[PDB]
UniProtKB/Swiss-Prot annotation, chain B:
Protein encoded by which gene: gag
Organism (species): Saccharomyces cerevisiae virus L-BC
Family the UniProt entry places it in: Belongs to the totivirus major capsid protein family.
Residues of the full protein shown: 549 to 598 of 697
Name used for this protein in its record: Major capsid protein
Function: Capsid protein self-assembles to form an icosahedral capsid with a T=2 symmetry, about 40 nm in diameter, and consisting of 60 capsid proteins asymmetric dimers. The capsid encapsulates the genomic dsRNA and the polymerase and remains intact following cell entry to protect the dsRNA from degradation and to prevent unfavorable antiviral responses in the host cell during all the replication cycle of the virus. Nascent transcripts are transcribed within the structural confines of the virion and are extruded into the cytoplasm.
Compartments where located: Virion
Length: 50, 50, 50
């Protein structure tokens, strides 16, 4: 059931036709950007994981 | 890069003694602090997925 | 014709009186800041050339 399992993939990702698998192990993920903002009794601190 | 409660590896009830002196610094952004004080607030945003 | 050739220079640049040329070669340019934003079928990526 193609239309069922095709819906599970995320909206941003649309994969191409071919895939040359040449191993018994494949990592899959995404490269996201995190913008953290910290606050406590001592004070405030702002950072960013690129 | 996340923490699940099942990493404790003990079903049931317990109390934890956290070592605050031996807090190593593996990956440091500008946000990263070692000494928390009072009520800790962390607000993060995730954008730019690929 | 001073007023004609003076108009050709960019609005931000106003040069000073003297210039001590001490060679047969001079580079001239500007230091700009570029804020690129990429989007394709795989996902989005945001950068900045400082």
């Amino acid at each position: 059931m193609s239309s069922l399992l095709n819906s599970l993939l995320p909206e941003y990702f649309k994969p191409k036709t071919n895939l040359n698998i040449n191993s018994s192990r494949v990592q899959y993920g995404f490269n996201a950007r995190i913008d953290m903002q910290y606050e406590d009794d001592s004070g405030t601190r702002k950072g960013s994981r690129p | 890069g996340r923490f699940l409660y099942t990493d404790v590896k003990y079903e049931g009830q317990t109390a934890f003694l956290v070592d605050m002196d031996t807090v190593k610094a593996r990956d440091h952004c500008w946000v990263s602090i070692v000494d928390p004080n009072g009520t800790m607030n962390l607000s993060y945003k995730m954008t730019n997925f690929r």
